[PDB]
Subunit: 227 residues, 4 copies
């Protein structure tokens, strides 16, 4: 009912020496076809989907352990209002430049638009009632959302991060959370990027200055702490 530290890089996580489920949230970031599925945004830009998809089954196991421990669980979906009123023109222009324009029709509907097949959370990690979903127009889950209000009213102080991609939406969310004083763990095997060297360097960045953004861990080490 109170858990020990996780074997983590570069310190035994978290810093206060124990994980309380009543103050800990598992975050699942952007597990959507647009980031890890055929026909979606990342696929249409020519990136290797095996680099993102490897995180899925490890994440499913960590989601069951969080449900079993009564951790809070929060899901994120990167996406835009169908009218695109939350889409900066630079973001739109780059997506067109990369051959996968946000709001344009691809094999999985309108790219990164809320309500579209490619925007949905994949079945492997489907949310259930009582696990709030953040709909974010940005990479960072804090910006232009109610996330911080959801975390503060639940008294959350500790975040465990899974999702995609490691260097983009996961790292942005970790950095925003860290600046607010949240104690964050990132799971090396439940994340993935458009480039394996970016995945590795993003985990590596976390570990400097005695853990500038938190700690990294394998899901095996978290499942071990959770019993």
């Amino acid at each position: 009912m109170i858990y020990s530290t996780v074997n983590a890089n570069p310190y035994a996580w978290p810093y206060d020496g124990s994980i309380d489920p009543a103050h800990t949230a598992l975050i699942l970031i952007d597990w959507q076809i647009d980031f890890c599925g055929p026909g979606g945004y990342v696929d249409s830009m020519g990136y290797d989907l095996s680099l993102t998809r490897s995180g899925l089954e490890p994440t499913a196991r960590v989601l069951a352990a969080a449900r079993d421990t009564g951790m809070t669980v929060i899901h994120t979906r990167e996406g835009h209002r169908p009218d695109l009123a939350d889409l900066p023109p630079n973001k739109r222009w780059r997506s067109a430049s990369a051959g996968a324009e946000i709001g344009s029709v691809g094999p999985c509907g309108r790219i990164l638009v809320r309500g579209e097949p490619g925007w949905e959370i994949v079945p492997e990690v489907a949310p259930r009632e009582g696990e709030p979903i953040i709909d974010k127009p940005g990479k960072g889950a804090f910006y232009a959302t109610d996330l911080d209000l959801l975390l503060r009213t639940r008294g959350i102080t500790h975040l465990i991060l899974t999702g995609i991609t490691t260097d983009v939406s996961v790292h942005t969310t970790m950095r925003e959370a860290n600046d607010r004083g949240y104690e964050c763990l990132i799971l090396s095997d439940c994340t993935g990027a458009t480039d394996r060297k970016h995945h590795e360097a993003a985990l590596s960045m976390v570990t400097m200055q005695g853990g500038v953004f938190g700690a990294t861990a394998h899901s095996d080490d978290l499942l071990a702490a959770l019993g």
Copy 2:
């Protein structure tokens, strides 16, 4: 005077195809002894200061052009209130773990405390009157500050980013800006990290997906586009 695009990775920056100094700000991030000087935070943790100091002279040249062209200039200092009311305990404990506890007395005073010698902006990139200084308790310049009010008040839409470190305060500040729709350039030779691989990987991360966080460039290509 408006200027054409910078030769950048992965697109000719900015996306809208001109640089207007009325709408552009040069950001100098955390050029402090604590991040690039003997006796400070980063030195005390045992990292190599030459990795952070190489960006100083190139930054001073970009600062000269930015003041030349009439674009706004904004400076940042990472630091805490002397009473540490703005210091999360996890940030404090990790700094102790690394051998350089925030608030502890080092060779340049209380480490990362506002008012202390190690927290001062180094003279090579000293601020002038009318160039606002951001005091931030975090790595991101937008969290717990007035930066967004300063930028919206001057009508800024475009940021040129310099300072340290590439993968920590610079990247966080770039990520925060980018999500609000600021168009951002990061200068490869005017930034630096506690690790060369982290600096290089931080620059490259920007360039993916057609420029997910904006674009990278050498100060040479910025100074060419400005006609300096």
Copy 3:
């Protein structure tokens, strides 16, 4: 580009004209929960005629904003059906006033997203291209994307309608003003649970040369728009 409005206490806006391309009409919380029988405000026993008098004037201002092509944004106060965005003090006060957020009344669960009492009333129904803000608080900025929507469209100027004058409208004006938005509040397109609070909310705006912006009757805006 349109002329200034005959406003209190200066000719609004401060920069001397209204550009539809930089102006948004905001319609705040026109929901059965705030102005309709069977909703939150009715359940607390407040007088609905105080809130409902602003409706037909708002409809008229909504038509003039649509005709001039300015941005239109609507707000709905409401909570996630799981109530993860509901502070315990807000819930507790609502229970205390005999209309608990989430409790079932004639119009479904009070102040819950998806429920009949939460919907925007038809007299000011939104149309395509008019973004709706879903807010868990009185202020339209807190825990929403409102500021992203406005900044992306280049909005500098807000015209404020909706209910109530002293709660959600005043909070939203105070938030927008502090960010440097130039705000007009329409006296006849707002209403409160108390006439004195309505009038006092409006005069608070007019102090110190217009501390939060300016007040106007919809007639004065429509005269400016014509």
Copy 4:
């Protein structure tokens, strides 16, 4: 250690049945010459300083009770960077319209500029070390400040509000706090406005809907509760 509720309007404050100093902050809002002093912004606009000053003596006594019980104490100053980079032009234009332009030289230096005599907290409620000061460029204490960071790192859940003016900075701070889930008390005698009717109407707005922004009380009712541990 833990204290009884306050006899407040419209419920015995706070909603969770007791006051814990470990989780409660006293906030002192904008007790500056520019709002309550001769030669300052409000004086230069022609408003009656007796309306703001009356709150000063009861505030000193509440400040004393807060420091005695070991509550957190936070002070705010409304003000602008000397370069005016945080000053929206509509704010400046209204101040010039009202005959007291922000940044302009008056009897107490540059009006509402940080570092100037008019801007200083007045000596009756001077901060001590360990009581953070918030420098805000707006009326609300949360916008473009670290206040939320200070409050959350200290585990503060409950606010007691004093300061000026009741209808501007104090109300705006209260609305911001309340929306984020903070439980707030506004002290009727430790606040004041440019208009008595605005002060009274600012306090009764709080009381509607079972206490839409929190509750109101007299310093006497607060001081009674702080003499009654449970």
